[PDB]
Amino acid sequence: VSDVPRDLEVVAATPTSLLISWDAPAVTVRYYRITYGETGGNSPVQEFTVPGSKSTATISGLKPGVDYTITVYAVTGRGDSPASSKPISINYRT
């Protein structure tokens, strides 16, 4: 049943750049929404949607040596029904 959020890990980092990768089942997923922000509360960093076509992603513009909270909102649907998914979030030091 539940199996949209999984395999979320970091492959490596680079000068002002990080590479995160998760999963994408075969169910025609409507779209994905990746949002991230450095712990602070001064202002959210950024977010971006994708047709679930990209299984990986390259994010940059962050600050090395700091806590970072990530949240992936996976929305699926068969046509237009209230098909609500199960979003998830986790904190990690990057």
- Structural domain span for residue 94: 1-94
- Identify whether the C-beta of residue 71 lies closer than 8 Å to the C-beta of residue 35: yes
| Cα distance between residue 87 and residue 74, in whole Å | 6
SS3 assignment, position 59:
strand
27-51 as b/e: b if 16+ CB within 10 A:
eebbebebbbbbeeeeeeeeeeeee
DSSP assignment, residue 16? T
| Cα distance between residue 12 and residue 9, in whole Å | 9
| Cα distance between residue 25 and residue 28, in whole Å | 8
Dihedral of CA 17/23/24/29: which sign? negative
| Cα distance between residue 23 and residue 89, in whole Å | 15
CATH of the domain at 91: 2.60.40.10
| Cα distance between residue 5 and residue 66, in whole Å | 24
| Cα distance between residue 36 and residue 22, in whole Å | 15
| Cα distance between residue 47 and residue 53, in whole Å | 16
The H-or-E segment that residue 82 falls in is: none
Q: How many domains does the chain have?
A: 1
